[PDB]
Design a protein around this ligand. Structure first.
Ligand SMILES: N[C@@H](CCCC(=O)O)C(=O)O
Lengths: 509, 509, 509, 509
């Protein structure tokens, strides 16, 4: 009855998964907490089982990771980068099968599952180069015979809590960067993507073990909220990177601040696309489509609000309705399928509640709005017109494929409306106007951390820093100098002289 | 009665100070809150009075500041730098008499008062050059016909809360940097340095108004804990920089996190100097003296722990005693005075309590330990030997001139003892050993934000970032790229083509 | 009959100039070579005289500069920045009278003369901040117990050869940057701007003397081609920065290479403005006017080629002709004069030589083309149409105010025509097309070192690097990390361990 | 007769080598010039033959590379990085046989042969990271409504001339960096390592072919000085990176300067190791051994001068003699030998010339000095004592394994003696003295491009820039921001507004 026992899914054994898998890894595999069974959202059938972490499992792992850190921090950064290079190779090798497991356990379509693993391969290549570059400037002291250098050192143990919707990539960004920065990692994933977490940890463990490194360098404790809270409250967790809901993120931030730890919060988005009158509609429509219905609307970067200039509102909406009706729905691993199930049955419930709440706040469902009559967690991608831009349901961020469409007239008001929500992740404008574009990029433009022009709100590349402002939580991951969040800066002055000139010329005599 | 009414203190009026002064500035001067009188700690005489902010003053000042921000953020950064340049020139012209006011109201000696003002002058020079440099990289997009740029924009209103012990420099570090980054500022100082806050703001307000700019760009609301708490709970304060006690800082970080604001925390230090057997003792003794007794021991970077290797412990301690007994006591505005009073009468009593608790816990007062027989808040700088490194009184947070002296034998134990406290601000080793110095700078060395060699724990220059780790709060000010804390990063992708290739080669069609 | 002996030019004495002035400074003033008289191009009247450098003068000056470098190089860079800050202040206080001398001796209008001095002011401000920043990274060594450091140190003596047309600013750019980088300078300006060079040198010398530093840190040796050739051949001149003709620059470049010195060449430009059909003509016409007739067309960044799309060629030409007729011609110090004389009587001949040649090669003079019958070296700013973009007269760059106008159709061809010339200094397109602008910035776009959009080819700001490609010589001055040309990089590996790991894991034992 | 026709050398076929090989590659393989036979320096037996380029081959190859660049420069940099990544992998997979070919045709020992290929692997890893990073800053313009951007674009065709002694790594540093920067490459190796150049080109060709890219992106034209002179005079070669003799490189720099090309010169080095009295002798002796006898003394970074403090001169010289006696001599393809032959018989003649001159000039051969009585180009590694530091023989340009040992007393004279040579590549001091180490890194310290402490002058790691000063020619390769030499910077100002504010506030009205 488990999918891993059925012959058409034997490929799961290529990831080393079996009927019951250990969900704790700290150099040894184990798990004394509750055995969880994860299910395929496309057909509600059980896949395999994972033994989750008890509290003793959590305690032992943290201790072994900190002991592993003593060895790992002594390994030169470029040699750490060589370990991350080998991880990138292992991922490359299994990108198709790991991508298939993402489609199977998470439910996003095969090209997105593969593409998500590509994000991990990309940031590995990136981190490999970064491991020969991380550091600070040597600066010219104002004092003779003094050297002034900025040093960066690992923070220690980096906890990583990831969400259901990107069960490989978010961990991969945090892992590759933290590792070359000399940190050890502790991973707690979404319980409903535990097989993916195990499969990824199996890949990493083999690399560590082949290199005669302690496996606790990349530790895994599968578990629910109790384990996540433990990490948020654990003084031995120097940096807690949390990707999840804003509500839970806020509490993670508070718990970390109470103990004077470090947090990196990557929280919800309420991302807007803005199509001005001069927009290239052949870019607008397919961009709104990918941003709205990509991943069945389940990215933190999904387009949730579409603002269209009055002159083109009807046409864009009609053109978008026709494109929705061509979306090919099916099993997320099937060829030509563009749209899969929602991840959980509760996500279907939430979708239903949001649709009905949108009607109660005066919206009109112009497309979709219904559960699909078929096995699995399938819902229709939905477009809602007629709501005020400040409608309560629109300012709520729901992980459901519902696109709230609004009219506007002037640039100034629509910038204000992009900015008026609590979230602050991604944003896009479609326009040809050179001046408007740079105003969008400037201090009176978009208040988000991702500020795009003529592309979807989703689909970032890894070379830039990824994250948001406001209620999205302020953390950054991946590229640019996001690596600095995973290290502690020291400002270092060395008197190599036989004198003691004081800063600012102070004569203390 | 008031010092400002006596002819010998007529120089206070060179700073625009009067018998009663407005403590609110926002383009207009006002103050409808409680009137406070500040006192000269060298003689316990009243200096002058300041009309603090009421709640209505605070509310109106924030509204004026955010209005001023609309203008100020539209001003090109180099032109904002020119304003800061002129502020630097204004401090330059007033440096002696501003320094003298710092000595009078706060109580540090004159070279420190002038030196503290000089830090503001220095960060002004630095920020002027920065105003032509701030920003992010243009990155190579993996996508044809796409540009990828990292942009930096002001966060908006920067609230700045400062302490009694650096009543000019800390505000200055924040102000110069926040200004060129296109932010407006709201300053709340220590009530017992209100005259200094008012005087500094009078200097800045004139530059702003001379440049026909709205004064609320650098707003001042003098007040106590209510004003600080209001700023911490106020969504209109985009970034709150807080320098103060660890306990209040923890409460400010929690409040700001509750509303998803940005905080920059600079809290207490419990800084150690470590002297190895190969140390040049002629560097040790004067460095210890200044680090411990400078500012009458009232810096967050004051050396409170002195670790001396067993072989040299008695000789360094004897030499410090002779050095201590030679320091010239007197009024702190008097040139060539080296030792002034503590800031308050309460501090004197807390100094006595610490000296008593040090004796209770086993320690021996080898020098000092008693109040001095003279007007004002004078205490003997004090040396306590014989305690264990883990003695309770030594892990405490006090602004009293007591130096706790410990013995050690080996490198590893004394690095660990340095790191064993809760704070993590400054640290220093004295040694000639090449390898030991690089180990101290590395991942197994000092855990502090400031990591010095053969110099005191105090007296940083502005060109590097200033701040600490662990319970020091994590914030950085002044140099390096601390300016990024005053701005929001955006990662910006611009599709300038007629096509829509997706990141990671994802084919969504 | 000297202008400086007339009462209306008494303001010259505010710069310390006299009837006959010393044109050698090395801490002392002197000059034993030939005496030069400079003439005011607006009336051809002699202004004053300058005693130029003999061979003995040059020898003694280089030696004194190199001896002064031993002191200067030991001053911490921020303290060298403080010197540059005072140079900036001295320039601020004399900006009007210095700009007037630029107008009197060089001949550009007063607003530009003042603007040119502002450039030196601006780069002083930049360099002051840079003096806290210059340096390289600390990198992660692949070898345990090794530090890896990029260090930057002065080259030593920077010779600076400047030209007649920017007789303050180019020296200024080189001066501020070289100084904070720890070099000493030796200046040989254009013979026909000798008083300007003396005036600027007097200003810097006072700052150096007021700071008790050897004046030879900023040495002057006024002279002609003999002194410049000596500098290019002199192994004691570590870096030679030459701004001048392509022809001379090539020989300078060869001579420095022959001796394995460092050269920084800023040579001629043949800058094109290209206006596409969708261009804002309200930006096009003023920008073209400023770029063509600014400085009577004697900048290396002056627009000499104007490509206009066929659809708008006639309209842009007509509007530009009407704009050329608005220009007020007069004495360059007279108010609201926008057009002054050419620098030399020789330039007037070449202008007439160029006009006759353009007609012979088939051009039509639609505006100007004649000498203005008045005192001074006044020629009409000229527009020439109907030539092929590949006509010889158009490629030979000369400083005559002659704009060559060309038609185009395709973006591809006209980008190629921008790039087909031997120089590669500045370039500008006028368009609204978002894709066109980013192609112009890209690898199939402009090949020039300055690549502008919707602005003239002249008028750079100091925050960026300044210089060109191809026959423009390759050097960069002023902003970005141009400072690195004035310093030597060293890559430094420090083994502080007891072991000897080899790079690349090479086992040699 | 040909080794490649002997069964024990069949491993050569694993590299695609044959009895007669094609020495031109531009997408297709050919070569119409002279057929060169390369020989094994360990036994003087012929290996295989290579058809070199005629000038028509060169002509056709340049034209093909320039067409390929039009395609290659359009490929996004991260995608170009992916090609280099696969080049890295292809090298990883062939590291043993390619290292053996280097050992066989060049003559260095196998562990260095492999290690040299490892440098190419390492720089591929670095370049892949870079390919996401290269770019310049976005700068805040002083003008409202203006963007200021520093852009980097490829130079076009990078001609790469390499030398016999590093026949793989030097090309690789240039290749990996030039490739990700969007340039195409044209390689001319040393004629006596023609098989190595063919073998590396075969590896890159397969990668290019497998990725459907034109092979001329990495073109090969094997040949001698006529081909090298052609590249130095060819305006189609935008950058010429030349590694070779000082005298040839000077002429290369002159030819390139004559045509306003870009050159990158990496010439000879007369590198010194300085041993102060406090030096750890257990680090000194092996470092001096490896730095002197590594590669049979044929590195440009080889240690030629060994300065030893008077007090330890005799001891280290005797300790270096006992190390020299332990050198294991034999054929270089053994994975266990330490010392192979010189590359050429003429190097033996030169070596014998220098030893005889050192003895004539008063030196004492204390070790070696003789040819080894076996087949091949074997000389004994030699130590020569008793010469002054300015003895003529010690200031020659000879790749001979002769180490010249000098005495010194104080730090100042010996720093000067390090600096007295014409070249400026590498340098190293052995000391524990902290102040001395920072003095050596500073402005009165070593003048070299590579400045090392307690390690060989040789054996750089790729993270930093590589190259020297003075007669070493000034170019930098590999790490840090050396990638900027392979690109052209542009300073780009974009007016996105409707106004025309001028720099420096010049009102042109
Ligand atoms: N690469 C993805 C990451 C989204 C992460 C998330 O939705 O939580 C994107 O840019 O849309």
């Amino acid at each position: 009855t488990l999918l891993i026992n059925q012959p058409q899914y034997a490929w799961l054994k290529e990831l080393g998964l079996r009927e019951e898998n250990e969900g704790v890894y700290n150099g040894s595999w184990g798990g004394r907490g509750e055995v969880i069974t994860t299910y395929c959202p496309a057909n509600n059938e059980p896949i395999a089982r994972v033994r989750q972490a008890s509290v003793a499992d959590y305690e032992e792992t943290v201790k072994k990771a900190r002991e592993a850190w003593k060895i790992w921090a002594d390994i030169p950064a470029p040699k750490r980068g060589e370990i991350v290079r080998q991880i990138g190779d292992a991922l490359r090798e299994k990108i198709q099968v790991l991508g298939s497991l993402v489609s199977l356990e998470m439910g996003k379509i095969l090209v997105e599952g593969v593409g998500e693993v590509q994000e991990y391969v990309d940031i590995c290549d990136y981190a490999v180069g970064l491991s020969r570059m991380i550091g600070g400037p040597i600066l010219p002291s104002e004092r003779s015979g003094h050297a002034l250098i900025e040093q960066w050192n690992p923070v220690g143990l980096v906890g990583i809590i990831t969400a259901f919707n990107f069960p490989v990539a978010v961990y991969g960004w945090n892992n590759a960067i933290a590792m070359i920065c000399g940190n050890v990692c502790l991973w707690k994933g979404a319980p409903t993507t535990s097989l993916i977490s195990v499969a990824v940890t199996k890949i990493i463990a083999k690399v560590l073990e082949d290199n005669k490194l302690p496996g606790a360098i990349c530790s895994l404790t599968c578990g629910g909220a109790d384990i996540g809270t433990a990490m948020a409250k654990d003084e031995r967790v120097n940096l807690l990177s949390f990707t999840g809901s804003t509500q839970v993120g806020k509490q993670v931030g508070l718990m970390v601040q109470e103990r004077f730890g470090r947090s990196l919060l990557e929280l919800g988005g309420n991302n807007a696309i803005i199509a001005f009158e001069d927009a290239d509609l052949s870019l607008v429509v397919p961009s709104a489509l990918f941003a709205a219905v990509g991943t069945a609307g389940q990215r933190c970067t999904t387009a949730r609000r579409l603002f269209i200039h009055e002159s083109i509102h009807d046409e864009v909406v009609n053109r978008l309705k026709k494109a929705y009706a061509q979306i090919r729905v099916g099993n997320p691993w099937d060829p030509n399928v563009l749209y899969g199930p929602l991840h959980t049955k509760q996500a279907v419930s939430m979708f239903l509640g949001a649709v009905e709440e949108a009607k109660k706040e005066g919206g009109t469902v112009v497309y979709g709005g219904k559960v699909m009559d078929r096995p699995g967690n399938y819902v229709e991608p939905t477009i809602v017109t007629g709501l005020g831009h400040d409608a309560s349901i629109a300012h709520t961020d729901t992980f459901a494929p519902i696109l709230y469409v609004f009219k506007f007239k002037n640039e100034e008001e629509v910038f204000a409306w992009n900015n008026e929500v609590k979230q602050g992740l991604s944003s896009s404008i479609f326009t040809k106007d050179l001046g408007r574009i740079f105003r969008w990029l400037g201090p009176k433009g978009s208040d988000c951390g991702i500020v795009n022009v003529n592309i979807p709100t989703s689909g970032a590349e890894i070379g830039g820093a990824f994250g948001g402002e406001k209620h999205t939580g302020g953390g950054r991951e991946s590229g640019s100098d996001a690596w600095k969040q995973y290290m502690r800066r020291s400002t270092c002055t060395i008197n190599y002289s036989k004198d003691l000139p004081l800063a600012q010329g102070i004569k203390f005599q």
